[PDB]
């Protein structure tokens, strides 16, 4: 459990990832598209962040 709490998603890295994705796409990217493009590991928190 200590190592579960040890690691997870990072909000700021997700900010950078979304910035890169939406600069590359240069268009409205829906939630399903963002989840598919960005590899899902902590997908709940990525949806929340988006």
């Amino acid at each position: 459990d200590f190592w579960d709490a040890f690691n997870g998603l990072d909000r700021e890295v997700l900010i950078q990832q979304t910035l890169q994705l939406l600069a590359k796409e240069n268009r409205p990217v829906g939630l399903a598209e963002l989840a598919e493009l960005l590899p899902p590991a902590h997908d709940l928190e990525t949806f929340a962040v988006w």
């Binding site: 459990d1 200590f2 579960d4 709490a5």
Partner: protein, 50 residues
């Protein structure tokens, strides 16, 4: 949660007639496994949690 189950359940029925519960800041200070065990307590009491 044990007491609220007590209050919410008349005798006879295994479940209280109102099964829902709400938790603000749920688990804001419990180690991950501790949170899991509390969740297990909720499930033992058989409640629908928020």
């Amino acid at each position: 949660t044990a007491s609220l189950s007590y209050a919410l359940s008349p005798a006879g029925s295994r479940y209280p007639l109102f099964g829902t519960i709400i938790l603000d800041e749920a688990f804001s200070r419990s180690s991950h496994a501790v949170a899991g065990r509390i969740i297990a307590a909720l499930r033992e009491f058989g409640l629908h949690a928020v």
